[PDB]
Symmetry: C6
Subunit: 276 residues, 6 copies
């Protein structure tokens, strides 16, 4: 367009911002507080940095998918060096079956039933694994319960989505059913801000059974069949011992590589048994 001096400066800034992959303020701060202060002083407003971060995020989300961030360069081929393996084996779940299920969920094998739901207390190997998976992926969104006008504000073009425990009201049942269906749909934000959402893997980190439509005090089961047909079931109950947690990304990468190296065709089974 202009390719003058300011254009070249902004181009080199975008290059130095996207060469390593930084979309948060703290990341760029820890990378180079010096350049951060220099850019903050060499600008009257704070909209240019926000636009650059948004462009970098859109580029890293459209060009790079999700399984590319789960590739393994060197497997470990061990069963005792991974805590998640022992966690899934203590509940009777098959390792190869769970690996194939995770591979099909991450790479979107089915599409319609792309929803992972858990049952049991969150302090028995749930919140720690969720935090580890959210830290392993550079982009992650969560559906909180604090915002009442729009609970889907922190999930705008993300690689993975998290759904905490909570009996959703009837005003968001259709929205949740359309989000879990897996389709790039257009949703607003608050005021003059509409954006599209691409099919992305979701994980329901709930504690109880949210399939029943529970609105305050009304317990209806009119949408139980579509909810059961659009989601899976991964119920497990086991007292996970303390002095653990905080799963590193190395074990996650190793398990993802083991799942990618062993592809097993899994049929449409809702009630996943505890065999293996």
């Amino acid at each position: 367009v202009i390719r003058s001096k300011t254009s070249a400066r902004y181009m080199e800034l975008v290059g130095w911002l996207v060469d390593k992959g930084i979309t948060s303020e703290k990341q760029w701060i820890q990378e180079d507080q010096a350049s951060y202060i220099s850019f903050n002083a060499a600008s009257n407003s704070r909209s240019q940095i926000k636009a650059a971060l948004d462009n970098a995020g859109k580029i890293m989300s459209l060009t790079k998918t999700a399984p590319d961030y789960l590739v393994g360069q060197q497997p470990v081929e061990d069963i005792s060096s991974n805590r998640i393996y022992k966690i899934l084996e203590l509940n009777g779940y098959d390792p190869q079956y769970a690996a194939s299920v995770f591979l099909g969920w991450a790479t979107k094998k089915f599409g319609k039933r792309n929803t992972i739901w858990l049952f049991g207390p969150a302090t028995t190997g749930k919140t720690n694994i969720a935090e580890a998976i959210a830290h392993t992926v550079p982009f992650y969104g969560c559906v909180n319960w604090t915002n009442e006008n729009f609970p889907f504000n922190d999930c705008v073009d993300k690689m993975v989505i998290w759904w905490e425990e909570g009996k959703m009201t009837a005003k968001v049942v259709e929205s949740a059913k359309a989000i879990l269906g897996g389709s790039k749909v257009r949703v607003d934000q608050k005021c003059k801000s509409s954006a599209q959402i691409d099919p992305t893997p979701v994980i329901v980190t709930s504690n109880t059974n949210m399939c029943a439509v529970i609105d305050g005090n009304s317990t209806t089961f009119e949408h139980q069949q579509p909810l059961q047909d659009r989601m899976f079931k991964f119920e497990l109950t086991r007292r996970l011992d303390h002095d653990f947690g905080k799963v590193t990304k190395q074990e996650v990468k190793d398990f993802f590589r083991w799942a990618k190296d062993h592809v097993v065709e899994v049929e449409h089974e809702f009630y996943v048994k505890k065999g293996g």
Copy 2:
């Protein structure tokens, strides 16, 4: 008049975006992220791109009709190759009658009876058709229930409208009744804004009874006669097998071509039977 460099660059950008048919954000990104970064480095503000997108959308909405870029140019001459045709055959609906109904709905043959209802659960053959309809239209409006102010925050003169079910208050019911009548009504956007909504075809993907008005604990349906008189229906409850899925745009193009080719007289039948 002045025809400075800014107006020339704006005209060049308009020509470049209309030469391929890109009036969004992610499409232009995937097309030429390099050119997008160059344009963002050129202009220092963020209102120029907004005005460009606004006038481009206005031109695309106030020029040619939707079927002009939705109809096909090659028939299929088959009934088992397309997934939508197989679904319509298994549902009992006549292919020629459904094609004539779709042709009359797209070209606004009736005007007042511009409603496509989907009675029954959505996970019974409706998901694939809904996905194909949503992916066929480039720019369409949606009515989400997450907005607690205006249900049409993304319907600023679009091609087709997507509708969802749920708890319907009096305001949204009156808005739907005014929209179904086909009238460009000037209504406020959200806050300190207003727009003139143009009569556009709508598609409802309900699950239960959409004619009933349910609000918390109040169930009213006294005005069901005008609602059922100013709307159509398409009840279907056939199971949709897995494996195959995700209908693209070629099937919709072939269906529109077959509808435009074979001309079938459209009747005023509200309660459509399951024969043909």
Copy 3:
């Protein structure tokens, strides 16, 4: 006043917009596609365009009124060949009496008793007639029900206001009574703003009995006599089928001229008699 260079250009632009008849964006785009190009070559801000539109609308509303152009010179040349006359004779009301009542409503001979009321079944098709009447008038407003903050946003210093269907709460009922009660008064328009209101005709499109003040769940009757003491009682019963509404801008002016050519004395009768 200062007499500069931009003032003459702004005056010429205002005169060109007034002579061409451009008050919003729909006609602004439908007139010529080079208007946006000329604007971009001249300046680069939508605030100037919005101010031009605002002052042009203010000039058109202050200099001339609605009956100044609603009654043309070309008559109808046929009393029977008229859709409005046809539906009026089908409803059973008096033609000359209704014409004189409409004439008194247009000139506001009563002040506090000048409000059009439409009551009856929805099978006749009053929505299409209301849409046609609203489209034949360039300056018109409607009561918005989606937001309870500022329900009177499009009817700011307009010529004719339109109402929706159903009931409303007391907070908006009082404002409606103050507006249609024949009293030039100012009220909050937008965010931290105010706008005056002149006794202008209001058309209620409520097909049900709006005299029952229902505040969402409690049905009251203390605001029924003063509500009915501000407009004439109207009640029509007729069942139609198809082919109704969507009239041109010439038949309305022909009917207006035919009604003006026949002046009938009207007293202060509440319910309009169906004799004649």
Copy 4:
């Protein structure tokens, strides 16, 4: 201090607009639409006209009040010329006592007891008198019940305030009690906007019973004693003649002159006696 050209032109325009004492815009339009269009074309600072109107209103509200502007030019001495005496004669109220009470309320004789309570719908003609007095005073305010955050947004540093009919809630009882006391109280608007309101005369234009403490669902009368002791009473019910009303400023000036010519000492009396 600065003494420039733009400041001199702004001061000249301010003096020209305050020379006649007009704070509206329609008067200036009807006077010289040409000069109005010239000033609109010469005003492109989107802040100069706002500051001009702000300082003009501040000068109009800081110099003289409103009742002093309602002084009579010549005494008429005729009970048939003033149309406001017929209502008092029909209702049996004392004309001289009511005139003295109104004169004491306008000149702030009692100080705290400076509020008149009304009782009557549109049939009594109180709304017409209120509209006439509001049109007589060049600047007034009205309480709107449509606002939810701040209902007194259109009543900040005014001359005379009107109270619309409506059951007060718990969120406005304290505000009304603080306003009735008369004090320069600082209150916020809607978002990042605060102002200090001066003790200003208010008057209630309620149609039904308002003194009864009806807060949502709580009906009490314990808080009625302060409202009865902080204001007088003026309840009357009498139907109008044959579309009688339309009072200008000459009648108000004549009434004020007649009240000033014959001043009657009025003590702290709540229930006004009848006789005249």
Copy 5:
């Protein structure tokens, strides 16, 4: 730091503001409308005046405390010259004891017990004394029910804050409890704002019963024990007289000077006896 023309200009403006104690708009208007108009015509963007007013307010709040605005320059040493003295002695309380209690409360001697329970309706004259105290010092706070959720919008960076009568529901009960405890806390303002409230002198006035914890629909006394533990008791009941009110600031200044002159060691007594 460059010492330019605008620098010296706004420095002289801030000096003139802090020399006379002007922090609002009407004060500066009455001080010098000429300079106000000159400054409004000099700069177009209205922000330099608000910044100067905020700086002057912060300077007056940081340099000058609350007791510095209460002590006078000439004592009177008389009991038959102050109206508040007669008001407090009509019940039977001791003047010197109440003066010493007020002096200890204004100096924040206790800290935790910084609230005095004042029982009595509007007939006791609490509103007049509250208005006199609020007008004596240019910085005051009023806990009125005008605001929605956060009524402490005009209490931040102030001195004396007077409460109002109102059944506080489950909204700001915990905030008030933390405020009366004598501890600064960073709390949010109205919306999209936050500020650190410091232990400021507060006086709670209850016309009816406010000590009971009325949370929505539950009337419990769980939070009442610390309430009565961190506050005293001062009940007064006396009917006011006619032609009395509007206490000047000089009376309160002389009262505070006499209180600072003669001091009395105040211990800890809840049920204050009516003697002395």
Copy 6:
């Protein structure tokens, strides 16, 4: 990176602001209003100071932690000067055990159980200890129970969080559970603003029971294992002396130094025993 005069000035200002650590703007004002006015004169906008405070807070929250502002320099070896020692001696809590527990909680050692729960009435003196702890830490946040839409407004990017007394409503129970888990969660702010919160310790300062989930009208005792095992138990009910509060930071520093001098092995234990 350009490195100009304004950039160097902003860099030196940031250096002079973060050389000692400044939180809000009132601290910098009271420190050097001279240089504050100099900086206000060097510029014109009011965003440079905001950006300076923002980056200073970001640096203080990212680089520095919490124990860095909690460690002391030399123990004082006293048993009567400290108040927490007397509190734990009168209640029966173990000195070294509680010291090691607090040291492990402040230095983030447990991870999953990095919280502290308090129980008992507020009349014993917990408010003074909470104020002292909040003053010992520079950056801290509190749960504002006023705004029901988002009570965690001031709890974004803080070293420690405080939880006031209030019922655990189901709309915030899930957010509180996610906060207790300890994960950098991305949540919205107030309007069109989102931020990522890092695992920060929280301290409950309630006086009622937090086991049974009470939502004002409903009560549930089902989901309680995670929220009951993700915290400890430190209750106290012994009342201290009268007017005994306002603790400085020297006592806290001495206690932290004494705890660091003698470290006791901390183990996972909910119901703490009394043995010291």
